[PDB]
Amino acid sequence: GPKFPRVKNWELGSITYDTLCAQSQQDGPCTPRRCLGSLVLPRPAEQLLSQARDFINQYYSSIKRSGSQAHEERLQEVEAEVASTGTYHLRESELVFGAKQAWRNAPRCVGRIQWGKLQVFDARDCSSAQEMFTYICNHIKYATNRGNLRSAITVFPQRAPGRGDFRIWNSQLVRYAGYRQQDGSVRGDPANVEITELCIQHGWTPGNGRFDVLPLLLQAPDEAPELFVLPPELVLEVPLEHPTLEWFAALGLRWYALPAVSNMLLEIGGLEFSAAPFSGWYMSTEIGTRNLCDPHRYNILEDVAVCMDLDTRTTSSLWKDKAAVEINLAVLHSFQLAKVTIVDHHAATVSFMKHLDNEQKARGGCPADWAWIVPPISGSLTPVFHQEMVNYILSPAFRYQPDPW
Amino acid sequence: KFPRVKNWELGSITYDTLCAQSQQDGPCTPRRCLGSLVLPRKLPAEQLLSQARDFINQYYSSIKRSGSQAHEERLQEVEAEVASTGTYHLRESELVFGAKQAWRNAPRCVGRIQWGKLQVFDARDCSSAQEMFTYICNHIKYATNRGNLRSAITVFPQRAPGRGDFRIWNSQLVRYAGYRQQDGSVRGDPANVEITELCIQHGWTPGNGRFDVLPLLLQAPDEAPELFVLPPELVLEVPLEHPTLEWFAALGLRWYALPAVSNMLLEIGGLEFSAAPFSGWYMSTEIGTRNLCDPHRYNILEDVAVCMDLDTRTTSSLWKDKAAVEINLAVLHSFQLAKVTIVDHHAATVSFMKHLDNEQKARGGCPADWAWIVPPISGSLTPVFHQEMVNYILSPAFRYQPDPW
Numbered sequence: 001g002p003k004f005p006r007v008k009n010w011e012l013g014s015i016t017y018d019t020l021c022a023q024s025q026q027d028g029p030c031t032p033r034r035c036l037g038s039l040v041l042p043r044p045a046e047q048l049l050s051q052a053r054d055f056i057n058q059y060y061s062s063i064k065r066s067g068s069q070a071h072e073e074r075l076q077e078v079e080a081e082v083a084s085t086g087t088y089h090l091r092e093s094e095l096v097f098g099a100k101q102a103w104r105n106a107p108r109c110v111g112r113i114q115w116g117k118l119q120v121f122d123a124r125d126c127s128s129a130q131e132m133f134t135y136i137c138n139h140i141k142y143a144t145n146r147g148n149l150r151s152a153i154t155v156f157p158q159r160a161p162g163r164g165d166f167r168i169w170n171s172q173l174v175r176y177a178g179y180r181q182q183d184g185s186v187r188g189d190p191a192n193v194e195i196t197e198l199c200i201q202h203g204w205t206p207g208n209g210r211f212d213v214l215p216l217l218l219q220a221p222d223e224a225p226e227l228f229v230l231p232p233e234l235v236l237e238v239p240l241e242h243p244t245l246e247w248f249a250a251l252g253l254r255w256y257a258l259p260a261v262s263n264m265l266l267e268i269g270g271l272e273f274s275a276a277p278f279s280g281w282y283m284s285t286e287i288g289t290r291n292l293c294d295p296h297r298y299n300i301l302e303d304v305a306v307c308m309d310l311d312t313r314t315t316s317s318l319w320k321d322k323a324a325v326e327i328n329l330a331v332l333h334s335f336q337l338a339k340v341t342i343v344d345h346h347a348a349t350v351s352f353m354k355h356l357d358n359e360q361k362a363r364g365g366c367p368a369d370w371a372w373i374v375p376p377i378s379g380s381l382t383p384v385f386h387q388e389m390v391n392y393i394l395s396p397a398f399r400y401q402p403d404p405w
Numbered sequence: 406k407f408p409r410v411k412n413w414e415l416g417s418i419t420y421d422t423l424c425a426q427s428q429q430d431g432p433c434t435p436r437r438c439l440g441s442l443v444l445p446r447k448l449p450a451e452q453l454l455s456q457a458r459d460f461i462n463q464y465y466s467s468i469k470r471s472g473s474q475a476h477e478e479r480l481q482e483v484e485a486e487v488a489s490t491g492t493y494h495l496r497e498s499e500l501v502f503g504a505k506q507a508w509r510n511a512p513r514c515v516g517r518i519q520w521g522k523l524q525v526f527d528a529r530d531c532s533s534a535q536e537m538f539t540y541i542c543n544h545i546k547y548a549t550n551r552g553n554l555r556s557a558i559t560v561f562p563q564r565a566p567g568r569g570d571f572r573i574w575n576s577q578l579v580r581y582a583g584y585r586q587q588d589g590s591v592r593g594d595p596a597n598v599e600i601t602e603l604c605i606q607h608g609w610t611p612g613n614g615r616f617d618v619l620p621l622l623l624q625a626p627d628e629a630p631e632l633f634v635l636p637p638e639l640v641l642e643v644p645l646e647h648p649t650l651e652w653f654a655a656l657g658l659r660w661y662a663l664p665a666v667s668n669m670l671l672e673i674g675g676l677e678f679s680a681a682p683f684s685g686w687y688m689s690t691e692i693g694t695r696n697l698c699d700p701h702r703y704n705i706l707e708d709v710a711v712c713m714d715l716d717t718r719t720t721s722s723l724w725k726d727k728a729a730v731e732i733n734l735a736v737l738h739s740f741q742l743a744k745v746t747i748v749d750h751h752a753a754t755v756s757f758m759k760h761l762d763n764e765q766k767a768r769g770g771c772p773a774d775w776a777w778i779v780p781p782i783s784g785s786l787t788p789v790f791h792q793e794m795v796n797y798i799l800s801p802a803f804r805y806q807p808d809p810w
């Protein structure tokens with residue numbers, strides 16, 4: 001065949017070849033001797049200019065003026081600007097295209113069918129922590145939209161030679177506190193124990209419930225982060241109930257509507273946007289399987305199983321599996337009742353399959369991380385399980401970055 | 406570099422040093438990860454000699470006698486035979502060691518905690534397809550053991566340069582027929598349509614049910630294959646019923662007790678055993694989820710869901726998930742009732758975690774393929790989902806080989 005990875009779907013028997021992976025200029029963690037695809041985090045003048053040129057070239061193809069006069073005049077401004085300053089700045093339309101392209105490029109994201117519909121708020125004029133807060137509130141208001149969620153990103157000023165970074169310290173805009181107890185256990189979300197404790201060191205007065213919304217810790221360049229409490233009425237939440245298990249409501253479980261990731265770096269054309277929070281909507285398994293059932297998260301499986309009167313003393317009852325199903329159903333049912341957008345793992349995966357086909361035609365491939373794309377319950381019941389995937393890093397991209405502290 | 410391997414549930418880290426022993430490239434490169442690919446893309450005396458000495462060294466090291474007269478003399482024998490004849494032969498105790506190690510080293514196998522407990526039948530004095538059948542019947546009978554299943558392997562004569570291979574054309578020793586309809590559909594197991602047709606064509610009289618056991622097509626070097634029908638009493642089957650849903654048994658479903666793979670090549674010390682069928686016992690998800698619920702296998706989700714009166718019109722009822730669970734529950738129950746060995750995915754993945762730990766201590770690592778280890782339902786509900794894994798090829802190994810037609 002062709003000299004590019006051959007990619008097979010074992011359900012359908014169909015074959016494609018990824019030619020896009022050719023465009024990757026950044027190495028992943030695998031070698032011929034060993035595959036490291038399952039690790040979660042694997043561990044410049046001419047350099048900037050060349051990322052810059054490539055990015056501008058991508059922009060000009062996307063509007064189809066490749067080789068044009070406008071294209072070559074932009075390349076020249078970018079070098080001029082780097083020549084005299086070490087950096088450059090993006091046109092507004094370049095930032096919009098780049099932000100959508102970073103989403104499109106994210107191998108781990110199963111919601112990419114939506115990649116073309118992203119509201120980009122340009123906040124590159126922001127000059128204080130107070131102003132970041134207003135921008136974030138506006139973001140949350142627009143995105144939440146009383147339950148009819150809308151994808152969005154708000155982009156704060158880029159990293160700049162020898163000035164401090166803009167950062168949001170929280171990993172998401174909405175997170176529940178986790179309080180370490182005398183007996184070593186955690187009340188709330190154990191994932192958020194470090195951020196919780198940071199908030200307290202910075203003057204936050206902590207509550208003591210299981211679902212306390214954290215304040216944001218926002219850092220403008222060369223300053224200590226400042227603490228901001230989110231108006232409760234801006235944080236839409238969904239109380240959890242089950243469509244037929246009437247006791248489920250009695251458990252007092254809830255989840256917030258808006259997933260908004262705030263600690264990633266958006267890299268476009270070599271420019272680095274250290275604060276660039278983005279939001280979409282939830283796939284139901286993120287709440288109902290990982291957040292509520294991981295043993296290191298809320299860990300509610302056994303409590304639910306006991307309420308369902310299952311035999312929890314033996315693996316072979318499938319008590320875990322039965323409980324997880326029902327918790328997932330409650331999540332979907334409750335969001336539905338509340339009119340808050342949510343997508344189940346079947347509908348998400350079907351639409352990711354359609355994404356794959358669309359991208360096969362547009363770009364000759366789609367970077368995808370199979371372990372993250374396949375959901376955490378009912379894997380082989382989804383069509384993605386049966387689909388081979390090629391994982392690689394393209395840019396623009398969202399990257400992890402180290403923590404500000 | 407040596408990889409760091411993190412468990413995300415317990416926060417523990419290990420380093421894999423065993424991967425340095427890999428002499429054999431996988432599908433990945435720094436530009437792209439191809440770990441989700443099922444099959445490899447591709448599929449002299451000095452090189453045999455070095456795989457040979459390496460394997461001889463592994464064996465003596467394993468019985469402690471590394472550097473003894475015996476050890477040096479055995480290296481000379483291997484050297485003398487290769488130098489003169491281009492090939493060599495294993496001693497039975499080496500073959501036994503090498504077969505156990507190949508299982509040990511299989512990165513896709515979740516059952517490796519059992520690796521040291523393997524009955525090895527040496528069938529290298531086999532000269533006809535007639536004799537392969539007898540050995541195969543004895544393997545089935547031994548390994549079945551009236552339901553108290555015992556892991557086993559039978560090793561037929563190695564490949565030899567001058568001639569065709571010994572081969573078992575079937576992919577397993579027990580497979581159900583798949584009969585294509587003139588209108589595209591299939592009766593029985595659509596995975597087996599092609600072998601089914603080969604059987605008819607070599608003169609099998611076909612059945613017309615959903616669970617007809619195939620004859621074996623056994624091939625001695627450079628001869629047409631011959632057909633052998635397995636005596637029904639050797640093939641232990643389990644009717645499927647549900648512990649509480651009485652209509653479930655009405656579905657007429659059943660599975661065989663003995664999973665015995667018969668198309669993989671066993672490689673030991675550079676020598677290749679093209680026919681080396683091996684067997685153990687089932688993990689219940691292999692039947693319950695994949696074989697019965699894959700859309701391209703028996704595809705019974707809908708029918709179960711209908712019998713359970715679930716709402717089938719909408720993915721967000723989680724009908725697929727609920728039916729899958731019950732079906733896996735039926736398998737486990739029916740195997741337990743029939744007193745036939747099986748293991749559920751929770752118990753299996755817990756055992757594998759233990760294995761990871763034994764192997765860390767014994768060898769500095771454990772090659773494992775995360776997409777194959779994590780089960781096809783309730784992924785994140787098992788500990789393996791949260792465990793990073795490093796995939797690589799050690800030898801002895803089980804490999805794929807081309808189909809003999």
Ligand code: HEM
Nearest residue numbers: 103106108109110111114151152278279280281282283398
């Ligand atoms: C429109 C609805 C969307 C859905 C349902 C969705 C779904 C998901 C899910 C389930 C994950 C895996 C998360 C996990 O297990 O922790 C994910 C990863 C991701 N998605 Fe989305 N996505 C959506 C929109 C977005 C948007 C708007 C962006 C950015 C503009 C985005 C970027 C990402 C990135 C960067 C990751 C990877 C995070 C990491 O590597 O840690 N997605 N997506």
Ligand code: HEM
Nearest residue numbers: 508511513514515516519556557683684685686687688803
């Ligand atoms: C004793 C119980 C055993 C259990 C429960 C078990 C379980 C499994 C499972 C569930 C798979 C994945 C199969 C699939 O999804 O298609 C598998 C793969 C495998 N196991 Fe086992 N295993 C067992 C014993 C053995 C033995 C005795 C051998 C060889 C002597 C073996 C060698 C393999 C190999 C080579 C694979 C990989 C097949 C491939 O890559 O296509 N296992 N194991």
Ligand SMILES: CCN(CCc1cccc(F)c1)Cc1cccc(NC(=N)c2cccs2)c1
Nearest residue numbers: 040041111259260261278279280281282283286
């Ligand atoms: C629970 C944490 N998720 C990343 C997982 C992670 C990664 C690295 C280190 C960690 F500790 C944890 C966050 C995440 C990221 C991206 C998307 C989603 N879920 C969503 N539905 C979206 C969030 C923003 C737009 S869609 C969650």
Ligand SMILES: CCN(CCc1cccc(F)c1)Cc1cccc(NC(=N)c2cccs2)c1
Nearest residue numbers: 443444516664665666683684685686687688691
């Ligand atoms: C269902 C198919 N499995 C092979 C997967 C495969 C690989 C390549 C191409 C395919 F079409 C399919 C068979 C298999 C292999 C190894 C182990 C098992 N299951 C078992 N429990 C055992 C079989 C033998 C010992 S344990 C199944």
Ligand SMILES: C[C@H](O)[C@H](O)[C@H]1CNc2nc(N)[nH]c(=O)c2N1
Nearest residue numbers: 038039040371372790791792793
């Ligand atoms: C070790 C393993 O990579 C890790 O637990 C992954 C697996 N797949 C995932 N998939 C998604 N979508 N989210 C995750 O956090 C993870 N965790």
Ligand SMILES: C[C@H](O)[C@H](O)[C@H]1CNc2nc(N)[nH]c(=O)c2N1
Nearest residue numbers: 385386387388441442443776777
């Ligand atoms: C494409 C993907 O690798 C493929 O569907 C794999 C995934 N994980 C698997 N895991 C097991 N145990 N058996 C399988 O056949 C597969 N199939």
Ligand SMILES: [Zn+2]
Nearest residue numbers: 030035433438
């Ligand atoms: Zn890889």
